[PDB]
Design a binder for this molecule. Structure first.
Ligand SMILES: C[Si](C)(C)CCC(=O)[O-]
Length: 123
């Protein structure tokens, strides 16, 4: 699965749902800054939340409850093409959960869950 399909799918899959988040606090942790933030260059402190808003939008983040089940469902279509490619991202999220271990602070949970997502899947 080309990265071009990864960012295009995850985005188009919730495009009308991602625009409200960026407007929620101010800006999108992505356009926040090309590559001058930290984790991936977009953001980190505000990323673990501004971008985490898209998570709670699909019933994956309940205040401080970091889940992944709803994601396991979108990874199915979001990663159309191969059967294992979907099975790969599945295990990837696991490394992000064991790392974020459901922190107390919202931005903290996301910052940890986002970081790992960039290290393994990059997106
Ligand atoms: C919500 Si969620 C799957 C972490 C999103 C991703 C990107 O695309 O960035």
């Amino acid at each position: 699965i080309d990265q071009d399909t990864v960012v295009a799918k995850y985005m188009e899959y919730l495009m009308p749902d991602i625009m409200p988040c960026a407007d929620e606090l101010h800006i999108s942790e992505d356009i926040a800054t090309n590559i001058q933030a930290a984790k991936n260059g977009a953001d980190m402190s505000q990323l673990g939340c501004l971008k985490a808003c898209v998570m709670k939008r699909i019933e994956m983040l309940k205040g401080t409850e970091l889940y992944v089940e709803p994601v396991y469902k979108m990874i199915e279509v979001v990663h159309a093409g191969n059967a294992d490619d979907i099975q790969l991202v599945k295990g990837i999220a696991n490394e992000c959960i064991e790392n974020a271990k459901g922190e107390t602070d919202e931005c903290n949970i996301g910052n940890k869950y986002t970081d790992c997502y960039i290290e393994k899947l990059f997106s």
